[PDB]
Curated annotation (Swiss-Prot):
The gene is OYE1. Keywords: Flavoprotein, FMN, NADP, Oxidoreductase. Changing Y288F: Reduces oxidative half-reaction with 2-cyclohexenone 6-fold. FMN binds at R43, T129, Q206, R335. This is NADPH dehydrogenase 1.
Length: 383
């Protein structure tokens, strides 16, 4: 037992929800009755570039391939057929033992304004790491990336949240994930954003910082710290081992280094806007750096950034306030995963985990009531 419904009693703005919604249209039908609820479809947007149409008319869906999720290939990336295409090649089978359902009559296809963007429907593309950025440089794929996003900007007025983008090398750790700090990166993102906009759709860049989820050896190779909230608690056995082997132990961030991250958040945010992005999403979920500060298991600090609910939320909120001041509140979003245990988070097992995120939602609303409301709040559903 555990629901994200508590957020609605606190935060009074747009809410994006994602997690196992594609194969459960009866759940979606109930949830979208709330006039400010949007739905994110992850794995099946990968397999269905025309997913928005298949949801409106209740069409069968293509199966997805887990093996080609993070593979450096066009296969399982840009070679997923639309429904009109899949028919011409046969069928011959789609998703097995599934009864589709038309949702074109529900609020899922009623327009709504998110930030500056006039969405025509509420089926959102959540951030989806595909690990196809070029190494070295963390550069967006020059061969397939533009076509990949183009296929999924198919339906006009579609909100798209990009794969997690590193705000800086220090925030990185994955060689095949795109960054958002350098020029040659922005040259590629500019093409991507243009292709999206030419399909009358919108694109939001997720600002990503790994934390203890980063590969310690990759950071040691580049003379970078393997940092997190604390230094006495680790993600798992492998990560602690790889940290000692590369002689790059887990580093507890100092206040100055925290300020440095914020500065990198700002620069990355302005880089995205300058490149022509509609807005940015602050990734504060799924066990990465900001979540590592939020979660009491990963945060054993005794200073201003730990020891309490208010302190553990300071980093996230400071990043929010910084980006709001930098590019405006109408271009800033925030993703949370209250019940998530991914990357060694506490989840519902921590009895005070709801209070922790209730506080964050409250602080967002206080800023909203004071005249600075974020574009949306992105929530990862319990599982
Ligand atoms: C291959 C893959 C990559 C993902 N990458 C990200 C990511 O980079 N950032 C993020 O916030 N969520 C990421 N997610 C989680 C999705 O945003 C979404 O929550 C997840 O797909 C569950 O929704 P679903 O049931 O529709 O698949 C990823 C999920 C998958 C399957
Ligand atoms: O941010 C969450 C996330 C989940 C799975 C991934 O592969 C990458 C990121």
């Amino acid at each position: 037992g555990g629901s994200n419904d508590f957020v609605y009693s606190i935060w009074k703005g747009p809410v994006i929800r994602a997690g196992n919604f594609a194969l459960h249209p009866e759940v979606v039908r109930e949830e979208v009755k709330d006039k400010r609820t949007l739905i994110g479809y992850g794995r099946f947007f990968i397999s269905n570039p025309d997913l928005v149409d298949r949801l409106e008319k209740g069409l069968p869906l293509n199966k997805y391939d887990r093996d080609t999720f993070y593979q450096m290939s066009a296969h399982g990336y840009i070679d997923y057929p639309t429904y009109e295409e899949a028919l011409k090649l046969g069928w011959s089978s789609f998703v097995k033992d599934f009864k589709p359902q038309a949702l074109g009559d529900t609020n899922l296809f009623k327009p709504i304004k998110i930030g500056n963007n006039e969405l025509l429907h509420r089926a959102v593309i959540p951030p989806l790491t595909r690990m196809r950025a070029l190494h070295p440089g963390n550069i967006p794929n020059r061969d397939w990336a533009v076509e990949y996003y183009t296929q999924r900007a198919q339906r006009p007025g579609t909100m798209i949240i990009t794969e997690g983008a590193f705000i800086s090398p220090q925030a990185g750790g994955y060689d095949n994930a795109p960054g958002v700090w350098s020029e040659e990166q922005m040259v590629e993102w500019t093409k991507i954003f243009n292709a999206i906009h030419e399909k009358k759709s919108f694109v939001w860049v997720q600002l990503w910082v790994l934390g203890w989820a980063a590969f310690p050896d990759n950071l040691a190779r580049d003379g970078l710290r393997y940092d997190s909230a604390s230094d006495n608690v680790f993600m798992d056995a492998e990560q602690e081992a790889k940290a000692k082997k590369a002689n790059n132990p887990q580093h507890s961030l100092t206040k100055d280094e925290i300020k440095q991250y914020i500065k990198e958040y700002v620069q990355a945010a302005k880089n995205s806007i300058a490149a022509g992005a509609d807005g940015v999403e602050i990734h504060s979920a799924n066990g990465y750096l900001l979540n590592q500060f939020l979660d009491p298991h990963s945060n054993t600090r005794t200073d201003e950034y730990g020891g309490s609910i208010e302190n553990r939320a300071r980093f996230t909120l400071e990043v929010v306030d910084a980006l709001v001041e930098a590019i405006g509140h109408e271009k800033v979003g925030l993703r949370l995963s209250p019940y998530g245990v991914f990357n060694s988070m506490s989840g519902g097992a921590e009895t005070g985990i709801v209070a922790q995120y209730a506080y964050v939602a409250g602080e967002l609303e206080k800023r909203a009531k004071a005249g600075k409301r974020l574009a949306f709040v992105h929530l990862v559903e319990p599982r």
